[PDB]
Design a binder for this molecule. Structure first.
Ligand SMILES: O=S(=O)(O)CCN1CCN(CCS(=O)(=O)O)CC1
Ligand SMILES: [Mg+2]
Length: 291
């Protein structure tokens, strides 16, 4: 039997849970299925990586390139203007999420277009990442470690930049064979210089589309009918839309900012809400019981 009251990780003040009885029954099912039935579906930026550090906001994978030595101050000025204009639409309470779709396509196309003009070589991504301020959430080594030990499928589905994300986890020593990355991947020219992005754009609000376009992955994992989903946006809730069969799914959401505005909505839509929480200890505690 599962009792959250007796799990110390669940007593942290960052832990908000609307329906603890329901959470216990989902976790109960996760434990029952063990390793053989488990898979993880997660975004990257601000979920696996930190939102802030020492009162200073940490970079998204996109920001790692924005802030690097290969990008000029005038470009960063334009990237910031794009962000100020378009982020206001992202967080706009009046527009429906569907209405925000074209605006997100514009923002990401325009910001990716600014990076392309700056001339980013593939060979420099290692240095750029090593010199960046990116941080993984506390407990990432045990997170990735226990999962790889038990061969648990991990699907990292990111609206960020796939090449950057991959370099982050590679340098962290946690890009193991069980980890599949679906993101916006760079397209390089004959000289190994960024000229564009591959495939269909993934942004904060269209992850449903990509979830369905990964049938290959999810049908291979038909038996993995128990899911742990980790997100930090409302859009991350769509990341399991491609899952073959669902027996139990637990949804854990990092609420990193806009806390007063979003808390009620997060508590209604995620089973577990982690408020201004920079660790993976709650998910790790569930894995400890399950694996
Ligand atoms: O062998 S099986 O795979 O069938 C289930 C055993 N598995 C191994 C470790 N235990 C004890 C950790 S805890 O319950 O103290 O967290 C959790 C579940
Ligand atoms: Mg994110």
């Amino acid at each position: 039997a599962v009792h959250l009251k007796m799990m110390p990780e669940f007593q942290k003040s960052s832990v908000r849970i609307k329906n603890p009885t329901r959470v216990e029954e989902i976790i109960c099912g996760l434990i029952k299925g063990g390793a053989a039935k488990l898979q993880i579906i997660t975004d990257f930026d601000m979920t696996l990586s930190r939102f802030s550090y020492n009162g200073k906001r940490c970079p998204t994978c996109h920001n790692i390139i924005d802030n690097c030595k290969l990008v000029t101050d005038e470009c960063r000025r334009k990237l910031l203007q794009l962000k100020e204009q378009y982020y206001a639409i992202e967080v706009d309470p009046v527009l429906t999420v569907e209405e925000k779709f074209p605006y997100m396509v514009e923002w990401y196309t325009k910001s990716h277009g600014l990076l392309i003009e700056q001339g980013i070589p593939k060979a420099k991504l290692k240095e750029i990442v090593a010199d960046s301020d990116v941080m993984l959430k506390e407990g990432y080594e045990n997170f990735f470690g226990k999962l790889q030990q038990h061969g648990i499928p991990v699907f990292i589905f990111s609206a960020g930049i796939g090449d950057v994300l991959e370099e982050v986890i590679r340098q962290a020593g946690v890009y193991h064979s069980n980890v599949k990355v679906v993101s916006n991947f760079m397209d390089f020219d004959e000289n190994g210089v960024l000229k564009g992005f591959k495939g269909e754009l993934i942004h904060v609000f269209n992850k449903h589309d990509g979830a369905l376009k990964n049938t290959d992955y999810f049908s291979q994992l038909k038996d993995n009918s128990n899911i742990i989903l980790l997100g930090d946006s409302q859009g991350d809730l769509r990341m399991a839309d491609g899952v073959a069969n669902v027996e139990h799914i637990l949804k854990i959401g990092y609420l990193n900012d806009r806390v007063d505005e979003l808390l009620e909505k997060y508590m209604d839509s995620y089973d577990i809400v982690l408020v201004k929480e920079e660790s993976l200890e709650v998910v790790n505690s569930i894995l400890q019981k399950t694996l």
